[PDB]
Design a protein around this ligand. Sequence first.
Ligand code: CL
Lengths: 234, 234, 10, 10
Amino acid sequence: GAMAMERASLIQKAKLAEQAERYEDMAAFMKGAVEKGEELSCEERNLLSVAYKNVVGGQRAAWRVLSSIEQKSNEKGPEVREYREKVETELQGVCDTVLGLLDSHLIKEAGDAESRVFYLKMKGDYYRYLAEVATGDDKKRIIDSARSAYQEAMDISKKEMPPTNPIRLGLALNFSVFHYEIANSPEEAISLAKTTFDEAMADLHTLSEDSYKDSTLIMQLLRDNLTLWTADNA
Amino acid sequence: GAMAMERASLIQKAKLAEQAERYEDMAAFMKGAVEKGEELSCEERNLLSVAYKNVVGGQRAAWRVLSSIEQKSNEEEKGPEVREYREKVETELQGVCDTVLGLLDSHLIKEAGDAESRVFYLKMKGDYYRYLAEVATGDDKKRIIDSARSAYQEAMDISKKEMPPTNPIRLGLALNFSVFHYEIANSPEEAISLAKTTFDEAMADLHTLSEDSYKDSTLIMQLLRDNLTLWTAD
Amino acid sequence: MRKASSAPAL
Amino acid sequence: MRKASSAPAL
Ligand SMILES: [Cl-]
């Protein structure tokens, strides 16, 4: 009917925006498709994720450039602060939009384990991107919201998914990053990454070639962080 | 009075946006600086150009991707989605070109000023009429093409009377005019002739070329050769 | 300490 | 023909 046709058009425009590398457009198209009220397939979930991660990823990178400049420049006007705060506000608005969409349409008690873990991990991620720029009481609440979302996804993944499942691995990875970079819990970050890597390793011999590459892709990232974090360099 | 302070702030924010690769922001900051009424230095001129080049460059690349899909959407899903989204991107691109051309006509193109300054802005006027021509169809297309050519020709007349053959502004003008000939005016032999003459005349003076312009002129010379190779392949 | 790697685009 | 190269920044 009308809903199906409209949804299909927005998905098609999201894919067109993807090919044109118009990620803000892509995100808005996927948001409209979500608001048609139907579940997202795996492919569509990834289109949604790609779009908003590209948008916020560009803002995060800009925010980090400006904070770095700010440090050394502040080592003289208010321009760097004002403009960094302009980028902050925009980044906060995009995360707010994603978090609202997750809460209003995507996070449900129903659905396979992958979908529920996917969206709750995504919720932890966008709260984590908010925490990167937050200060004060707002930061403490955001951090609590990130942890709560990550922990809920972790509970489901540990109960319903194998240790090698790439969505489970991706969640553990990001949660460990949260521990290290946001929650100020380096031992927990290192412990969680170590456990995730090891528990995955123990089951690799059972996987197909395609599953093996998907799992090992994230396992290398875990290793990469472990090597980074476990070093007397600083 | 304090305008000079605001203008300095807009320039500083344009430089921050550039370092953060936020070209839409950069362009708007430079638009504001231009609208303070003061003429732009060489550096500020390039900031303006860099900002808008990147903005329309993303739009043009997106427009080309979409037009190609549209032209080939005949051979899976079909539907008006491609044309609708292409037209949206096209309208945005036209809006940015109109803004730059309006700034050029309103604040930047003057009778006075050094030759390099007048050439720079008339070349920019040719350039943004050329971007309009890339997407123009039918009625206004002839006008837009005539407006690009008149701007490029006046710039060319100035450059050939008042600047050396190795001057990077003159070289970049000749390059863009040869692209105009090939891509817009469908005059391939004229485009090849201009590129070859521009390259050969600069190559004959390169021994003199000042080290300050070596790289800039050299890069443009490289591009003239790239286009020649692309155009004379047959 | 440089920023750690998070899950990639799937 | 592919898009010709035009003048770069600076
Ligand atoms: Cl529900």
